[PDB]
Amino acid sequence: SPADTNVVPAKDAPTTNSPPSTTSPNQAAADANQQQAGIVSSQSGPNAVGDSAPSSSVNNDGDIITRPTSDSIAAVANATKPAA
């Protein structure tokens, strides 16, 4: 039977349950990365105190982004267009 043997991580599987937050997301993405799994807070001692997961609110360099990286480069290159 398929679905019990063909189990593989989905599309954008590290950062898909990450909520959009502008504050300390990595600890907020990991707060909901392990909430969708169903683990309650009492069943995790220090495993859920200070954890981190990659978020969709952080770009690769590491600065807390809001709009995606293709729309942030476009936020700079649209402000250096003089009249030709």
* Three-state secondary-structure class, residue 58: strand
* DSSP H/E element including 30: helix 25-33
Whether the Cβ atoms of residue 57 and residue 18 lie closer than 8 Å to each other: yes
Amino acid at 76: V
39: left (phi over 0), alpha (psi -120 to 50) or beta: beta
3-state secondary structure of 69: helix
Distance between CA 17 and CA 11 in Å, rounded?
A: 12
CA distance 81 to 74: 11
* CA distance linking residue 1 with residue 10, whole number of Å: 19
Report the sign of the C-alpha dihedral through residues 5, 6, 8, 12, in that order.
negative
